[PDB]
């Protein structure tokens, strides 16, 4: 499982988006019998929290998920070639750390809950 | 919950595929206050790992999941009547233990990631 882990860390975002399963499979597994257990418990919570995010968004069970949130040029004005072909995910995460929680809120609030309510109303027509 | 657990272990695979929820519901729950806790933690990890497999495949949230991996006669030449009507899951698992990781790799690599990328590209047409 470990093999290939973080190998595309220095690759472009496009090239590094085809190895998502390699990172995904590496997120899940005498006081030293307690502390290690705590670490195991910690890993589970982190995994579940990320999965919870994917579930409050319409992204449950997916590694690549398309959404209805428009991109804002304030978050980033770079082209697609300057993000996917000429840029790595670490650089992108360093720039967009500043805006992550606005995008997360837009993902959580407007799009998924309005889409879910609209499916609730279309299903009773 | 426990009632009916593994009851279809000796039944045919077809008959035993209608009781999947009975097994699914039984997977989730002083040094003896630590060891038991470790066991509980262990159960969670196992559950999550299986769920993780189902998520890296296109099978999240399903107990029966159809895929795009063709069956290979090298894995098994038996008919459908000799698998579903005249055979149990333990016998099937004993034969196909030898081939499980090839099927798992084909499930993980070609079909789900190519399908996910193709949906990523169809959604922008």
């Amino acid at each position, epitope marked *: 499982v470990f093999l290939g882990f973080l190998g595309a860390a220095g690759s472009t975002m496009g090239a590094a988006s085809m190895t998502l399963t390699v990172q995904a499979r590496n997120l899940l597994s005498t006081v030293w019998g307690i502390k290690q257990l705590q670490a195991r418990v910690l890993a589970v919570e982190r995994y579940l929290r990320d999965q919870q995010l994917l579930g409050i968004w319409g992204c449950s069970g997916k590694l690549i998920c*398309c959404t209805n949130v428009p991109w804002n040029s304030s978050w980033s004005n770079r082209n697609l070639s300057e993000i996917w072909d000429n840029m790595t995910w670490l650089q992108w995460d360093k720039e967009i750390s500043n805006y992550t929680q606005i995008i997360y809120g837009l993902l959580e609030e407007s799009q998924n809950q309005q889409e879910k309510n609209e499916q609730d109303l279309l299903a009773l027509d | 919950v426990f009632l009916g657990f593994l009851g279809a272990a000796g039944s045919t695979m077809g008959a035993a595929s209608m009781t999947l929820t009975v097994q699914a519901r039984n997977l989730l729950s002083t040094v003896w206050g630590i060891k038991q806790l470790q066991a509980r933690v262990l159960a969670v990890e196992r559950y999550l790992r299986d769920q993780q497999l189902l998520g890296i495949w296109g099978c999240s949230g399903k107990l029966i999941c159809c895929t795009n991996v063709p069956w290979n006669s090298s894995w098994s030449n038996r008919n459908l009547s000799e698998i579903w009507d005249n055979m149990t899951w333990l016998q099937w698992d004993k034969e196909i233990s030898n081939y499980t990781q090839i099927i798992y790799g084909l499930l993980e690599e070609s079909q789900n990631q190519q399908e996910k990328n193709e949906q*990523d*590209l169809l959604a922008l047409d």
Partner: antibody
Framework: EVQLVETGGGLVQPGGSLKLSCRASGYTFSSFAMSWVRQAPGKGLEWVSLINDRGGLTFYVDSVKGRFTISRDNSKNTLSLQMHSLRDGDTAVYYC??????????????????WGQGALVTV | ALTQPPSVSGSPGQSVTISCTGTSSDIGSYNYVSWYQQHPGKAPKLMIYDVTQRPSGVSDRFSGSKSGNTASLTISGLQADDEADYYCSAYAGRQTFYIFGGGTRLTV
């Protein structure tokens, strides 16, 4: 530099099964989507089929949807079109071209950028 | 299919505006109208894409524009070497992709 060169073109009868092959050079073949577009001798251009950069998504016009089959090999840089049950309306110069779509991670390429010499097909 | 004038004419140094009319589902729904120039005996060449955008190597004399459900190709500075059949291409959705118009005979 982009050189598209079609072959396999000739003459066939109704019900024929004709295979064309377009060889590409001068650019990254696997990075671009490809299309086949046809021109009847006395008419204008008609789009026939589209295949994406990975060769997994194929699109056809209704008139050929169940008869034509676009395909690609990215190691050999070869685009191919297999037409079965050829009809009298399929007589045309067929051209292979680069473009028609792109993946979500690229800019839109809803146009045919580069073109081939063409290949005459008489049913 | 798109409706396009069968032929136009213009004297050298003058400017012509080939037109192109489509339904609202294609020209009036997507801003993806491209223009191709085909000389007799050769294959088309992308003069314009995305309504107003020119491939590199293409002279500035060729320009495009849209108006509702109509597109146009303004060819200024007409030269003898512009004598070609011009074609429209509009993107028309996912159930159908590319619709071409008829050819326009340009004479000088």
């Amino acid at each position: 530099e982009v050189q598209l060169v079609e072959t396999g073109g000739g003459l066939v009868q109704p019900g024929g099964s004709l295979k064309l092959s377009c060889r590409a050079s001068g650019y990254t073949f696997s990075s671009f989507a490809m299309s086949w577009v046809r021109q009847a001798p006395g008419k204008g251009l008609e789009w026939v089929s589209l295949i994406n950069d990975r060769g997994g998504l194929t699109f056809y016009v209704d008139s050929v949807k169940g008869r034509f089959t676009i395909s690609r090999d990215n190691s050999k840089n070869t685009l191919s079109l297999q037409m079965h049950s050829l009809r009298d309306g399929d007589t045309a110069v067929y051209y292979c071209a680069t473009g028609g779509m792109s993946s979500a991670l690229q800019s839109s390429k809803y146009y045919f950028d580069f073109w081939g010499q063409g290949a005459l097909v008489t049913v | 299919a798109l409706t396009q004038p069968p032929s136009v004419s213009g004297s050298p140094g003058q400017s012509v505006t080939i037109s192109c009319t489509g339904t609202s589902s294609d020209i009036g729904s997507y801003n993806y109208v491209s223009w191709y120039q085909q000389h007799p005996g050769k294959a088309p060449k992308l003069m314009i894409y995305d309504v107003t955008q020119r491939p590199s190597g293409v002279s500035d004399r060729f320009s495009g524009s849209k108006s509702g459900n109509t597109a146009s190709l303004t060819i200024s500075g007409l030269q003898a070497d512009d004598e070609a059949d011009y074609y429209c291409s509009a993107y028309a959705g996912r159930q159908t992709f590319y619709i071409f118009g008829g050819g326009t005979r340009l004479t000088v």
